[PDB]
Nucleic acid binder design. Structure first.
Ligand SMILES: CN(C)[C@@H]1C(O)=C(C(N)=O)C(=O)[C@@]2(O)C(O)=C3C(=O)c4c(O)cccc4[C@@](C)(O)[C@H]3C[C@@H]12
Ligand SMILES: [K+]
Ligand SMILES: [K+]
Ligand SMILES: [K+]
Ligand SMILES: [K+]
Ligand SMILES: [K+]
Ligand SMILES: [K+]
Ligand SMILES: [K+]
Ligand SMILES: [Mg+2]
Ligand SMILES: [Mg+2]
Ligand SMILES: [Mg+2]
Ligand SMILES: [Mg+2]
Ligand SMILES: [Mg+2]
Ligand SMILES: [Mg+2]
Ligand SMILES: [Mg+2]
Ligand SMILES: [Mg+2]
Ligand SMILES: [Mg+2]
Ligand SMILES: [Mg+2]
Ligand SMILES: [Mg+2]
Ligand SMILES: [Mg+2]
Ligand SMILES: [Mg+2]
Ligand SMILES: [Mg+2]
Ligand SMILES: [Mg+2]
Ligand SMILES: [Mg+2]
Ligand SMILES: [Mg+2]
Ligand SMILES: [Mg+2]
Ligand SMILES: [Mg+2]
Lengths: 55, 101, 88, 64, 117
RNA sequence: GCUUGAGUCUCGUAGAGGGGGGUAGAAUUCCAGGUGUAGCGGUGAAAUGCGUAGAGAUCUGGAGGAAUACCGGUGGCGAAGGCGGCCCCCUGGACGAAGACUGACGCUCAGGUGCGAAAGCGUGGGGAGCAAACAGGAUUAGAUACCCUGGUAGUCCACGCCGUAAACGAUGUCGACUUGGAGGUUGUGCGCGUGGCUUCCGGAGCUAACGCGUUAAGUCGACCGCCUGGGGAGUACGGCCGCAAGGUUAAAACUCAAAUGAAUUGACGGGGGCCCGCAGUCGUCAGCUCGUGUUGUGAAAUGUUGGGUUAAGUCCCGCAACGAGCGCAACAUGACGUCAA
């Protein structure tokens, strides 16, 4: 997520463009995922659970 | 014989040494009853990221048919040549003659 | 695996013809060639257990084909194990 | 899928113009569920991108 | 007291604290402030408001360097990601770039065990 | 004898299948140096800890180990255990097409043999991060814990050992047969076929029920393994195996009239959703039931749930229910019941 603040653009428009680039890249979710170790058994269980409710 | 695709990229200061290297590396291959199906000098390009402080490198592509030992010998040359900053040797299924992107 | 050329040789020696790929002698000769070839692999790669399971299947298949041939024709059996240098 | 539609067999790591369509601005490989690439071509594409990244034809990240 | 027209604001937004460090573009620090060292401890330290006040006090700390424009490097998941940058805008800096520089391993090291709260 | 089971050959396809070697980028830690200055770190709140002997932050250079973001998928491969960056070398299996070939060469398998997660063990390396033990800080009535700061074995590599896991689909292997629907993945022939593998739903049938349902827990056949009330006990003794830890084979006395599975009605939850009240009894709370019908082997269920709305099971609309009673309301009034009050 890298915004150059473009000419004759207000700061809210610059900053929400940064917010949207971060949420698209998925920084904070990736950070929160990596805060603590998840056992592979736990990871597979989570993946299965998400899948069973996707379908 | 096996078909290989070889990319190597040379230190930008040794760009003038590349024509001599190309004719030397092809000489090694042709001497083993090997073939050169393609040989492209792409020239100095911008690297997508810095490799050992450098921001550019001189790329060379060649597609080759040869025994595995001369290819193994050519990889040791790349290892022990400080001009060659990086290389990739890949098996191909068939010969590749047509021009690259 | 065994090359097209090496396979085709073995079919010529042990078969009735180039087409005779099915005969017990050819089958046993082909298995023997690959078993012998793989000795070099497993000398270097002692912990390639997954590939070794494929080797032991070749060994078992050869044993079953030889036992079939022995009771079908003892003389052909005797000729074959001499040519290939097998104990039994 | 473009690769299926346009009769592509092996996706080329050298074809940087094509590969740039299937990475984000962060440099990340775009999922097949977004682009609609077929599974078979998605695997070739991932390999092509990783080769290109090794040769510094593509970036790994937007911050080297 | 040397003049430093163009600068970089580095925002270290952890879950517990916000560190604002303004540097030159060589990465030499000119001044810093933190939510923890701006009259906030414990629960208040980890808030967007404490991050705002940290950014204001960091702007005061770099008053003499004559920095007029800033790039913003934001690092981490914490509550002071956005409020810090709004405060630098309110301080009268021209924000030229905004960049996320949050470290993400491409696998990396095993994280600590999950907390059983 | 035969070619239909089984196998061989030819061409091709996908794949984290295996073994060996190399390499890339991100990140953590450490070291050296620059800038900079009073905090950092951590928690529910703290404190221990780190920091003016200059931390944390930020930039530059370097060292080292381990793991490979995105791709990524009820995805793929493998006998199972398991297998994930990229490149090369060696190598196993599967599948498809079109033939040709062998001619029952098959299936299963006590004993036997091999493979077998993690932890653990031996010898020699390695050690970033993480972390049993351990130390300190908290919490607490206590706290040999959970939380915090650290941290050794170990986690990594080589070779050898161990042989166990909820090693699970809690479902042995092989073969045949028996309505459908929707997907995924991988071949292949001319939108339409035809193979392989795989996921979800469901029919008959099966099942105690839950459920299973062409990948059967259906209908059959072959062979193996295993069970015979709960405990005592997967324990003792003996044997075998192991460096050890222990594994494996495997009783008896004694003791009880149960233990157990699935499902039902309640009640309860420091489960979820939606509401209400100044937040004799519960309580003037909006509930509680019955007949007949229907569903279930049955306890039972349905009605009474649902979408709205109401002070209200109030009312409307839908609905395998159709009606009815006691409460609500209407004309102080306390439903069925609860507390052996
Ligand atoms: C007679 N016959 C050969 C028995 C038997 O069939 C056994 C079995 N597991 O089937 C034994 O263990 C049996 O063979 C056997 O070994 C027996 C025993 O070891 C003991 C010991 O050691 C001590 C007390 C009681 C016994 C026991 C009664 O269990 C013994 C029974 C034996
Ligand atoms: K080199
Ligand atoms: K047998
Ligand atoms: K350690
Ligand atoms: K039932
Ligand atoms: K058996
Ligand atoms: K008993
Ligand atoms: K009834
Ligand atoms: Mg922590
Ligand atoms: Mg392979
Ligand atoms: Mg090894
Ligand atoms: Mg282990
Ligand atoms: Mg050890
Ligand atoms: Mg720790
Ligand atoms: Mg701890
Ligand atoms: Mg067991
Ligand atoms: Mg398992
Ligand atoms: Mg499972
Ligand atoms: Mg079992
Ligand atoms: Mg499979
Ligand atoms: Mg079903
Ligand atoms: Mg025992
Ligand atoms: Mg024993
Ligand atoms: Mg009721
Ligand atoms: Mg009523
Ligand atoms: Mg109704
Ligand atoms: Mg009334």
């Amino acid at each position: 997520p890298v915004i150059k603040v473009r000419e004759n653009e207000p700061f809210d428009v610059a900053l929400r463009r940064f917010k949207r680039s971060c949420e698209k890249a998925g920084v904070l979710a990736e950070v929160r995922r990596r805060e603590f170790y998840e056992k592979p058994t736990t990871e597979r269980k989570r993946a299965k659970a998400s899948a069973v409710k996707r379908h | 014989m096996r078909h290989y695709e070889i990319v190597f990229m040379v230190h930008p200061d040794q760009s003038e040494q590349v024509p001599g290297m190309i004719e030397r590396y092809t000489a090694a291959i042709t001497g083993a009853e090997g073939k050169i199906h393609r040989l492209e000098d792409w020239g100095r390009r911008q690297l997508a990221y810095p490799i050992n402080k450098l921001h550019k490198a001189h790329y060379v592509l060649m597609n080759v048919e040869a025994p595995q030992e001369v290819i193994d010998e050519l990889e040791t040359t790349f290892r022990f040549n400080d001009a060659v900053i990086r290389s990739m040797v890949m098996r191909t299924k068939h010969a590749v003659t047509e021009a690259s992107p | 695996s065994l090359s097209t050329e090496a396979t085709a040789k073995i079919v010529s020696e042990f078969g009735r013809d180039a087409n005779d790929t099915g005969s017990t002698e050819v089958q046993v000769a082909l298995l023997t060639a690959q078993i012998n070839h793989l000795q070099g692999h497993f000398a270097e790669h002692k912990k390639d257990h997954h590939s070794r399971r494929g080797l032991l299947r070749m060994v078992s298949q050869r044993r079953k084909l030889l036992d079939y041939l022995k009771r079908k024709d003892v003389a052909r059996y005797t000729q074959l194990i001499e040519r290939l240098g097998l104990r039994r | 899928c473009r690769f299926t539609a346009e009769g592509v067999q092996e996706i080329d790591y050298k074809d940087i113009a094509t590969l740039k369509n299937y990475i984000t601005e962060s440099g990340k490989i775009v999922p097949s569920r977004i682009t609609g690439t077929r599974a078979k071509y998605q695997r070739q594409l991932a390999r092509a991108i990783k080769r290109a990244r090794y040769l510094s034809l593509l970036p790994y990240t937007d911050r080297h | 007291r040397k003049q430093v027209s163009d600068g970089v604001a580095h925002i270290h937004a952890s879950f517990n604290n916000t560190i604002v460090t303004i540097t030159d573009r060589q990465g030499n620090a000119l001044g810093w402030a933190t939510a923890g060292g701006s009259g906030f401890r414990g629960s208040r330290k980890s808030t967007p408001f404490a991050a705002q006040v940290a950014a204001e006090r960091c702007a005061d700390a770099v008053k003499e360097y004559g920095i007029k424009n800033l790039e913003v490097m934001v690092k981490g998941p914490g509550p002071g990601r956005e409020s810090t940058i709004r405060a630098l805008n309110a301080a009268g800096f021209r924000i030229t770039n905004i960049t996320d520089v949050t470290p993400i391993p491409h696998x990396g090291c095993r994280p600590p065990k999950k907390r059983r709260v």
